[PDB]
Amino acid sequence: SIDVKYIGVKSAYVSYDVQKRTIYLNITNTLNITNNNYYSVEVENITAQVQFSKTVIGKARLNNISIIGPLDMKQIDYTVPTVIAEEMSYMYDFCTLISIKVHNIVLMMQVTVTTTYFGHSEQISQERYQYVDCG
Which residues of the chain form contacts with ligand NAG (CB under 6 A)?
25-26, 30, 32, 34, 43, 45, 64
Site string for a copy of itself, 17-36 (x = CB under 8 A): xxxxxxxxxxxxxxxxxxxx
Tell me which DSSP letter residue 88 carries: S
Q: Cβ 124 to a copy of itself, closest distance in Å?
A: 5
Positions in 43-102 near a copy of itself (CB under 8 A): 43-102
3-class SS of residue 21: coil
Q: Cβ 35 to ligand NAG, closest distance in Å?
A: 11
- The residue number whose beta carbon is nearest to ligand NAG equals 32
With a CB cutoff of 8 Å and minimum separation 6, the contacts of 39 are 2
Q: Are 117 and 53 in contact (CB under 8 A)?
A: no
Q: Cβ 29 to ligand NAG, closest distance in Å?
A: 11
Query: Considering beta carbons, is residue 47 or 82 the nearer one to ligand NAG?
Result: 47
Q: Cβ 127 to a copy of itself, closest distance in Å?
A: 5
Whole-angstrom distance, CA of residue 38 vs CA of residue 36: 7
Whole-angstrom distance, CA of residue 118 vs CA of residue 3: 24
Query: Considering beta carbons, is residue 68 or 84 the nearer one to ligand NAG?
Result: 68
Nearest to 122 by CA among 4, 5, 40, 43: 4
